[PDB]
Design a binder for this molecule. Structure first.
Ligand SMILES: Nc1nc2c(ncn2[C@@H]2O[C@H](COP(=O)(O)OP(=O)(O)O)[C@@H](OP(=O)(O)OP(=O)(O)O)[C@H]2O)c(=O)[nH]1
Ligand SMILES: [Mg+2]
Ligand SMILES: [Zn+2]
Lengths: 69, 201, 1340, 251, 140
């Protein structure tokens, strides 16, 4: 269901926006989770170029610089 | 019309076209002097007749209730139907009178065409108001329902060009307030639904 | 006909006679408060009542008792006017007599000594104005009457949604006026439960055990006994011939030597008629029928003395044998029938973990306060205090009434707390409804909703004030020494005065008076709210209570309710409504005895009204007052139908009584869609008062009632003649009849002049009479704001014509001719109060000196030597009103500033510039300056000039009183001397002061001269003291806050015209925002050349079914027609005859009305004055449901010489050519609401930033930027707007570093952004990192 | 410690002398709903403002009527720049004093920085991407916003006193972003269903309807005219009725 | 009654020796029931076309509540008509099954003239009235 599907998100930063914040962080802090941004919500939080539209150019061009040399 | 302009000439010409439509439509609308006065809201000549007929129809179902031909719960929904019908008769009565009855002549004898009555031009074009709302200005305005939801078995027989009386207005009250109450929440319901949807997309 | 009616008479259509004229509209507020504060020599609610509850207070059984004597209310410290300017609350000191008695140890009920301490002071308690408002800090506030659930017991449902089984449930609730709630509720298993408040559920029978009822008495109380006899061997049974109804035969059932029914045949009307008529008392039975029955009382074995069976234990065929061999002849059993008398209480006992009294009393204590150990003294006292203590519990009288009422008792009053019987009787009645006998109540019915208002609600705040002082008094009475402490040492002031200041200061029911409008005030003071203390919450209920209930008819308005998040949670009081003796809502009706309709009126509460059959408002009765028709439309028990001529018991008083004051002011309302009607009376109160008080051409008749009862106007106390008329004051020389015997004199009304409202509008009174005019008692003496000639004029009507005008009325936008703004007529005057504070900071004191660093003389011109701006100076944005400087030493400037100071030689000051300057964009004239200075700081130059001027002014005012009052008093002395000694010329040669000596021969005329002497010498001295206090109040040190030295309050009078953006609307819910202001050259004009003021869009009318606005426009048009007729004849100077002939014709019109008119009015001097007031137009009245009808309207267009169409032809002012088709023109009364553009319009480039979050924030009234919430961000995400978004929540707001790097780039002419990271997230990183969470930024 | 981290998962330690419970670390992140900072609203924003909206049928669809007073305060850093670029100000501190004085010279400068510099208009409940649209600003004497009537449909704006907010695209990117994505003329089709959302609303259709309509007999009946050009000539001068049956040459 | 009008049917008339429920009588109620059913089907079908036009045009915030009010009345009624059609269909099953004309509680026969007013009647006046009484007591 739409409401349940959204509840599962890879980025832990996104979840603490609209889910219950206390639970999200705890579950994530023990796991040692690494958030790579990639999604929209989190990039707005941290205030950089949205990884779509005009920003897609930048994020794409920078994502490839990663896992490389 | 605007649509076809897009799919044939492209973005730019459609845009500037749409400007011309607005500028001109406003200008000639002003020249037209369309307005609205009391005499614009033409009541059907048959209205008072139609009521007394369906009003006597209730007098049939009444005779049967007191004489036990029909049962009590039954009788409520019987009368409510013969009223609900008469309203559809009154509605398409004024709509036949209002629509075409400007009867005018060209050199020869007689002819009739779509009316040029002010309040009509508005609805047929689609500028504002609909036969639903018009039905409340000239014809009677429907049946209302008490807070229950159970639509009341003696409709609003008056319209807005006439007065309403004490009771008729008081009955009209419920639907208005629930109307406001609902759309206050029907605003919230949209808002919550769209919110859930972007979270998953 | 009266005196200010003779001036201008509204032509009234409408046939139904007014039988009862509108009572005082402020009845509710004024009445309720008067009961609370008043000596009542008995218990009825008041300060006396509250006292008598807590008092007498007695120390901890130490036989040291403090009892309550009586109380007094000190005089107001400042009166209303005084208190307002300065900013104190309008309060009176409360002095209460207290008696401290001491009993010897152990003196047999008698005293060692008692000190009868005179009236200790316990704070000042606020007072209500003449017009039903309070003053809290020089600011008028209103206390909204409240709507809450009536005290008592109410049985409710909760059908359906419960458990998804259907079943329904039934619950009873005992809601007392003060003390804990007692809830009784069922469950699916049909187990009875109780919970106090909303706490933990508990098995219901536990409370019976707490009242010292054991199991046997519980069975005995709620159930019957079925007596089983063992006669011979094996079982007989006592049979009640009724018990067998609703059941089938259990065996071969026979008696009286004849088998009536055999096994398997249900016992019906045949069998019960047989049993009842044949009188079957005893029958023999098998030993197996008691296999299921439950034994009633306790039965033990007579020999071994052991327990055979405990009460409420089910027997078996074997259990009987154990108590049969023990010699038991009786076994009492329960009668159990799951249709009639259900085995409910039996099952409950099996779920009860308790058994005795202390067992339950513990289980109650541990439920209320779990976690801590129970004690013997704790559980008994706690429970005895819950529902049985006079102090901690009370149902009141209303609670006791509905209690006895709902339970079918006879007594209407009794205990104020619950008794052992009361609780049991309730449990009994609750069971009955579940059995099918009886129906449940509903919360919504206005007989179970009660109205409280200020007088009552204040009582509770004093009571809580005392209960928290009572602990303190009891505490002191513990240790107190002999005759050293007295009943003042213990009672503190702060505890009493705080508990009352809390309410009137900040409360959901104490709010800033909605005061832009005499209607706004009167509609506020008559207002209800179901919110706040003791009522529902917006998030709780729940549409049932919000919706309009049938019982609202004639009590609550159906249409005047707010349009927001709480619709129907407010409502407004209906016109004729009044509050029941018991505090319910009643409405007036007419007693129909047999077939005649009487005029004796009865007030019927919501419960009372349902029973009777009430006729309708619009009903035709003639001659003696018989109903004309044999059948009349009426409403009786919640529904409406046709009724017989002689069945109606009552009839509606008026056609109006269903609406509110707001709703009744809409003309042709009947013709307006209900939805738009709400907005009409909703926006009408938001009408800002106009420059020139107009008057509605199209009226309803109510405007006079609203103007007078609202305070804004000045209403004559006593009838008389005008001696002196000034723009300042008005003196009325009183008639002989109304004038009191002594002190004689004249009534002198001091007028309210130009002053700030709650919503920054201006409230100004003006004289409406001329020199030497006759006025009678209860006449209109002076108009308020937005009132004319005694009528309520919330706006100004103008010539309006419906037609598209090149789109400048596209939606509901409005297109206005320049002639309107030129006529300055919708121009509107606003008054803001701006203040400057001299504080004390750690660095030093602030000075109000006119020496301001780095400003030119251009600034210091409007400021006097002392530092205050002059009165009368027309000032604009940026100009300094009050020069002020704050201590800021050692600035620590930088090189280039230092070099700059050295190049141009400025002595870099050790003081900051803090002066109060005029807010950007707003501009007006200074009309008054007040200065409040700390007690003991020297009044500066201007302050002393001011406080000297207030002194010189105050002396002139008081003496003017005496001069006018003397001559008024001396003039009466002259007349009583003439009755038996009249020396007209001889008397007034000698000095008038030398009159008091003259006596009179043996007669009452000698005692009359004596009366004026007494009251003369009192005028001499009362003058003296009124002058003294006035003088002391000016010079006395004005007390301020801590840290603040002195304050300058400047009052500005800004005159705002009207411009695109202002919201305006007619009374029919037609909103619109003025869009362009057109030249008169461009306006649509008619063949007479007269332009039109407003051009409205015809599209707004069909959709929004407000058809009255059209009717208003037409009737208004005809009303202006009569104006143009009289105006022509008045300019022709035709003479009284032709004029009066025409006026007489106007006021009749068609036949059947209620109006009546001349020629009685004195055929000259009076007839001519009227004509003038009509040439502007003839005021007409369309009552709410009694309105005018088209024929009468069309008929008045004929007299006005205007087409019946209501439409004329117009010509476009630009092209000059004709407009095809006729357009409607007419006059529509229109309001300008205070969503005026130059209040809404805000803008900010770079401004102040919030400390916690570096985020644009309104600090200097350069307001915060717009909030760019979640939804506005999704907007940018749907476009590709990646950069537009970054900049939006980076440099434009949160990025402390980016914003300046950007701003510098902007002026450098480089459009870039150097974003970096928002501080909002930087703090989250810190906020998270300060929890146990290690949050880092990885990688690169 | 527990009351410090997340108060409420105990007995609710209260703040000193104050009945209200004290806000903990967890409560400083948590809220309704989630992170307050990211929840609506949503962060206030520089270079912005609002007021009541009105009409202005004289606009082309790609522009809008922006109060003189507002545009002055909004573009304040831009004016300070352009003022000293052309040399009208010695230094920024002088430029500040110039626009404060409202010297008449500045109005002509403001129109420079205004020309090709879009602004964003946004109305109350932002429902679809058309809830924000970009227009070219035209200076207005008055304190109201002028809103092109055809976009009113998309906004579900009437004129019963509704107010709108403005936002200035600062960066060069934001101008070109607002011009190629958010500009009025680039979004005339609803993204929900390919049909035009910039359909003529009400007043404007009542106009065209009455115009292209016919009655049985009126001025001009049956005559013939060379073309549309001279058909207007016939009407504007009162020779022909707007609605009369007529053959004309058209191309 | 416009119900009897919708079909080209006239009130029946039991003749002297006419047997109770015969072929001609069930043919009589079938025409009325189908015509009544056909009329109801047109009401649910028409209504929707107006309903689809209003929902497409967006009302002004002010007239949303006034427009909605007329929509709610229509909606509630329609569900009753759906119930009515389901009751008619249920009554139409009684004709085909040859069990029309009698009381459902007791075997008593329901009047002929009584059935012409409301052909969907299921009980006689005695059982029907008693049922309504139980209702007010078992409900409230
Ligand atoms: N307005 C209307 N209703 C009809 C009509 N025909 C059938 N109904 C619905 O059927 C129900 C009543 O018919 P029955 O099921 O036979 O039960 P009843 O007659 O013994 O009350 C009601 O349901 P209900 O609406 O859910 O409850 P209620 O109306 O009894 O309160 C009623 O509204 C009709 O022609 N008009
Ligand atoms: Mg709006
Ligand atoms: Zn039967």
């Amino acid at each position: 269901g739409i409401t349940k599907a959204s509840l599962a998100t890879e980025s832990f930063i996104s979840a603490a926006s609209f889910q219950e914040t206390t639970r999200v962080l705890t579950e994530a802090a023990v796991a040692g989770k690494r958030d790579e941004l990639r999604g929209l919500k989190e990039n707005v939080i941290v205030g950089r170029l949205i990884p779509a539209g005009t920003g897609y150019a930048y994020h794409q061009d920078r994502m490839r610089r990663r896992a490389a040399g | 019309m605007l649509n076809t302009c897009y799919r044939i000439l492209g973005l730019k010409p459609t845009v500037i076209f749409a400007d011309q439509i607005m500028y001109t439509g406003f200008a000639y609308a002003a020249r037209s002097g369309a307005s609205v006065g009391i005499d614009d809201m033409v009541i059907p000549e048959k209205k008072h007749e139609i009521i007394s007929e369906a009003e006597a129809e209730v007098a049939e179902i009444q005779e049967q209730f007191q004489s036990g031909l029909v049962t009590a719960g039954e009788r409520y929904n019987k009368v409510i139907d013969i009223w609900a019908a008469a309203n559809d008769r009154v509605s398409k009565a004024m709509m036949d009178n209002l629509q075409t009855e400007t009867v005018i002549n060209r050199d020869g004898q007689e002819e009739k065409q779509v009316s040029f009555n002010s309040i009509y031009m508005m609805a047929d074009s689609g500028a504002r108001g609909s036969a639903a709302q018009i039905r409340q200005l000239a014809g009677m305005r429907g049946l209302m329902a008490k807070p229950d939801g159970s639509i009341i078995e003696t409709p609003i027989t008056a319209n807005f060009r006439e007065g309403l009386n004490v009771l008729q207005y008081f009955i009209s009250t419920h639907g208005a307030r629930k109307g406001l109450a609902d759309t206050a929440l029907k605003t919230a319901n949209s808002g919550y639904l769209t919110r859930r949807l972007v979270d998953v997309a | 006909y009266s005196y200010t009616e003779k001036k201008r008479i509204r032509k009234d259509f409408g046939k139904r006679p007014q039988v009862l004229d509108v009572p005082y509209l402020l009845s509710i507020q004024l009445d309720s408060f008067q009961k609370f504060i008043e000596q009542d020599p008995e218990g009825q609610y008041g300060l006396e009542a509250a006292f008598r509850s807590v008092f007498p207070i007695q120390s901890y059984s130490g036989n040291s008792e403090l009892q309550y004597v009586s109380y007094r209310l000190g005089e107001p410290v400042f009166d209303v006017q005084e208190c307002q300017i300065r900013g104190v609350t309008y309060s009176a000191p409360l002095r209460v007599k207290l008696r401290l008695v001491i009993y010897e140890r152990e003196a047999p009920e008698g005293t060692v000594k008692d000190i009868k301490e005179q009236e200790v002071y316990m704070g000042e308690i606020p007072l209500m104005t003449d017009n039903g408002t309070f003053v809290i800090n020089g600011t008028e506030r209103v206390i909204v009457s409240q709507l809450h659930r009536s005290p008592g017991v109410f049985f409710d449902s909760d059908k359906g949604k419960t458990h998804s089984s259907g079943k329904v449930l039934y619950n009873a609730r005992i809601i007392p006026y003060r003390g804990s709630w007692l809830d009784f509720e069922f469950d699916p298993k049909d187990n009875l439960f109780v919970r106090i408040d909303r706490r933990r559920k508990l098995p219901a029978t536990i409370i019976l055990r707490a009242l010292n009822y054991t199991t046997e008495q519980i069975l005995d109380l709620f159930f019957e006994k079925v007596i089983f006899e063992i006669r011979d061997n094996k079982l007989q049974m006592e049979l009640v011939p009724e018990r067998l109804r609703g059941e089938t035969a259990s065996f071969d059932i026979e008696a009286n030597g004849k088998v009536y029914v055999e096994k398997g045949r249900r016992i019906t009307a045949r069998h019960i008629r047989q049993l009842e008529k044949d009188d079957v008392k005893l029958i023999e039975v098998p030993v197996e029928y008691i296999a299921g029955k439950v034994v009633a009382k306790d039965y033990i074995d007579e020999s071994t003395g052991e327990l055979i069976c405990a009460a409420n234990m089910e027997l078996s065929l074997d259990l009987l044998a154990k108590l049969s061999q023990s010699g038991h002849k009786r076994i009492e059993t329960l009668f159990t029938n799951d249709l009639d008398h259900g085995p409910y209480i039996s099952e409950t006992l099996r779920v009860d973990p308790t058994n005795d009294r202390l067992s339950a009393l513990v289980e109650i204590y541990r439920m209320m306060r779990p976690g801590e150990p129970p004690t013997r003294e704790a559980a008994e006292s706690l429970f005895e205090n819950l529902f049985f203590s006079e102090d901690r519990y009370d149902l009141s009288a209303v609670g006791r009434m509905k209690f006895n009422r709902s339970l079918l008792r006879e007594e209407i009053e009794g205990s104020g707390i619950l008794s052992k019987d009361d609780i049991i009787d309730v449990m009994k009645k609750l069971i009955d409804i579940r059995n099918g006998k009886g129906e449940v109540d509903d919360i919504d019915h206005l007989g179970n909703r009660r109205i409280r208002s200020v007088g009552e609600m204040a009582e509770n705040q004093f009571r809580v004030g005392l209960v928290r002082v009572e602990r303190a008094v009891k505490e002191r009475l513990s240790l107190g020494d002999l005759d050293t402490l007295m009943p003042q040492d213990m009672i503190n002031a702060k505890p009493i005065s705080a508990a009352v200041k809390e309410f009137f200061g900040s409360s959901q029911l104490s709010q800033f008076m909605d005061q832009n409008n005499p209607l706004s005030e009167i509609t506020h003071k008559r207002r209800i709210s179901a919110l706040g203390p003791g009522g529902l919450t917006r998030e709780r209920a729940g549409f049932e209570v919000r919706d309009v209930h049938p019982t609202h008819y004639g009590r609550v308005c159906p249409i005047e309710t707010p349009e927001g998040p709480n619709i129907g949670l407010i409502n407004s009081l209906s016109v004729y409504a009044q509050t029941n003796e018991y505090g319910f809502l009643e409405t007036p009706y007419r007693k129909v005895t047999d077939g005649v309709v009487t005029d004796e009126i009865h007030y019927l509460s919501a419960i009372e009204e349902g029973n009777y059959v009430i006729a309708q408002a619009n009903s035709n009765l003639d001659e003696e007052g018989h109903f004309v028709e044999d059948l009349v439309t009426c409403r009786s028990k919640g529904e409406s139908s046709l009724f017989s001529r002689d069945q109606v018991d009552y009839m509606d008083v008026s056609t109006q009584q269903v609406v509110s004051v707001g709703a009744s002011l809409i003309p042709f309302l009947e013709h307006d869609d209900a939805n738009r009607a709400l907005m009409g009376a909703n926006m009408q109160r938001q009408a800002v008062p106009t420059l020139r008080a107009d008057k509605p051409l199209v009226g309803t008749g109510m405007e006079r009632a609203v103007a007078v009862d609202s305070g804004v106007t000045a209403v004559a106390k006593r009838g008389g003649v005008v001696q002196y008329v000034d723009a300042s004051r008005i003196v009325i020389k009183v008639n002989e009849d109304e004038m009191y015997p002594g002190e004689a004199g004249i009534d002198i009304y001091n007028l309210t002049k130009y002053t700030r409202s709650n919503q920054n509008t201006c409230i100004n009174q003006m004289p409406c009479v001329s020199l030497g005019e006759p006025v009678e008692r209860g006449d209109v003496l002076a108009d308020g704001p937005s009132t004319d000639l005694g009528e309520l004029a919330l706006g100004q009507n103008m010539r309006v014509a419906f037609m598209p005008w090149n789109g400048y009325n596209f939606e509901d936008s409005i297109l206005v001719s320049e002639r309107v703004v030129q006529e300055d007529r919708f121009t509107t005057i606003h008054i803001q109060e701006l203040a400057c504070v001299s504080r004390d900071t750690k660095l030093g004191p602030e000075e109000i000196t006119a020496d301001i660093p780095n400003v030119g003389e251009a600034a210091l011109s409007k400021l006097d030597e002392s530092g205050i701006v002059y009165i009368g100076a027309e000032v604009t944005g940026g100009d300094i009103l009050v020069g002020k400087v704050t201590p800021k030493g050692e600035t620590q400037l930088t090189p280039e500033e230092k070099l700059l100071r050295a190049i141009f030689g400025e002595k870099a000051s050790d003081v900051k510039d803090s002066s109060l300057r005029v807010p950007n964009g707003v501009s007006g004239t200074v009309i008054d300056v007040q200065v409040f200075t700390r007690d003991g700081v020297e009044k500066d130059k201007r302050a002393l000039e001011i406080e000297e001027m207030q002194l010189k002014q105050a002396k002139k005012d008081l003496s003017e009183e005496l001069q006018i009052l003397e001559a008024g008093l001396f003039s009466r002395i002259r007349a009583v001397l003439v009755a038996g000694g009249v020396e007209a010329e001889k008397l007034d040669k000698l000095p008038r002061d030398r009159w008091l000596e003259l006596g009179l021969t043996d007669e009452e005329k000698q005692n009359q001269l004596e009366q004026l002497a007494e009251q003369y010498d009192e005028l001499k001295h009362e003058f003296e003291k009124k002058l003294e206090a006035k003088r002391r109040k000016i010079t006395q040190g004005d007390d301020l806050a801590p840290g603040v030295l002195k304050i300058v309050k400047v009052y500005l009078a800004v005159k705002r015209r009207i411009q695109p953006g202002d919201k305006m609307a007619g009374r029919h819910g037609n909103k619109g925002v003025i869009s362009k202001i057109n030249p008169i050259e461009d306006m649509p004009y008619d063949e007479n050349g007269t332009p039109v003021d407003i051009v409205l869009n015809p599209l707004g009318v069909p959709s929004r079914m407000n058809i009255g606005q059209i009717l208003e426009t037409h009737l208004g048009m005809a009303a202006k027609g009569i104006g143009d007729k009289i105006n022509a004849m008045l300019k022709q100077q035709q003479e009284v005859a032709k004029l009066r002939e025409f006026i007489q014709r106007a006021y009749d019109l068609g036949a059947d009305v209620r109006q009546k008119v001349d020629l009685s009015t004195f055929s000259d001097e009076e007839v001519m004055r009227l004509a003038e007031n009509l040439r502007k137009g003839m005021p007409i009245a369309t009552p709410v449901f009694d309105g005018a009808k088209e024929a009468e309207i069309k008929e008045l267009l004929k007299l006005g010489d205007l087409p019946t169409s209501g439409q004329i032809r117009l010509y476009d002012g630009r092209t000059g050519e004709q407009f095809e088709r006729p357009v409607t023109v007419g006059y529509m009364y229109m309001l300008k609401l205070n969503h005026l553009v130059d209040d809404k319009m805000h803008a900010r480039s770079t401004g102040s930033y919030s400390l916690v979050t570096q985020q644009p924030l309104g600090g200097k009234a350069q307001f915060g930027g717009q909030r760019f919430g979640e939804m506005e961000v999704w907007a940018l995400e749907a476009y590709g707007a990646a950069y537009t978004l970054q900049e939006m929540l980076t440099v434009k707001s949160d990025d402390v570093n980016g914003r300046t790097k950007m701003y510098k780039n902007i002026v450098d002419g480089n459009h870039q952004m150097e974003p970096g990271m928002p501080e909002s997230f930087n703090v989250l990183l810190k906020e998270i990192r300060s929890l146990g969470i290690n949050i880092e930024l990885e990688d690169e | 410690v527990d009351a410090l981290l997340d108060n409420g998962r105990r007995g609710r330690a209260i703040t000193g002398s104050n009945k209200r419970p004290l806000k903990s670390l967890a409560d400083m992140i948590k809220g309704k709903q989630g992170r307050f900072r990211q929840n609506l609203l949503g962060k206030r924003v520089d270079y912005s403002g609002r007021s009541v909206i009105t009409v202005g049928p004289y606009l082309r669809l790609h522009q809008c009527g922006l109060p003189k007073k507002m545009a002055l305060e909004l573009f304040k850093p831009f004016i300070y720049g352009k003022l000293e670029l052309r040399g009208l100000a010695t230094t920024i501190k002088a430029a500040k004093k110039m626009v404060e004085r409202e010297e008449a010279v500045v109005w002509d400068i403001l129109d420079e920085v205004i020309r090709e510099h879009p602004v964003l208009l946004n109305r109350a409940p932002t429902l679809h991407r058309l809830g924000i649209q970009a227009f070219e600003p035209v200076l207005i004497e008055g304190k109201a916003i002028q809103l092109h009537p055809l976009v009113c449909a998309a906004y579900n704006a009437d004129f019963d006193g509704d107010q709108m907010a403005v936002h200035v695209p600062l960066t060069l990117e934001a101008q070109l972003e607002a011009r190629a994505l958010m500009m009025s003329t680039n979004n005339i089709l609803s993204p929900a269903n390919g049909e035009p959302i910039i359909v003529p609303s009400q007043d404007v259709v009542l106009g065209l309807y009455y115009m292209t309509r016919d009655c049985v007999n009126a001025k001009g009946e049956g005559m013939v005219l060379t073309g549309p050009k001279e058909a207007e000539r016939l009407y504007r001068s009162g020779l022909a009725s707007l609605h009369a049956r007529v053959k004309v040459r058209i191309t | 009654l416009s119900i009897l009008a919708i079909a080209g049917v006239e009130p029946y008339q039991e003749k002297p020796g006419e047997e109770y429920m015969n072929e001609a009588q069930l043919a009589h109620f079938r025409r009325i029931l189908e015509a009544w059913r056909n009329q109801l089907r047109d009401e649910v079908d028409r209504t929707v076309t107006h309903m689809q036009d209003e929902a497409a045009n967006f009302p002004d915030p002010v007239d949303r509540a006034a427009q909605e009010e007329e929509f709610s009345l229509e909606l509630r009624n329609r569900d009753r008509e759906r119930k009515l059609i389901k009751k008619i269909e249920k009554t139409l099953k009684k004709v085909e099954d040859e069990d029309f004309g009698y009381c459902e509680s007791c075997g008593v026969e329901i009047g002929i003239r009584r059935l012409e007013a409301r052909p969907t009647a299921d009980l006689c006046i005695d059982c029907k009235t008693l049922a309504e009484i139980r209702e007010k007591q078992m409900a409230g």
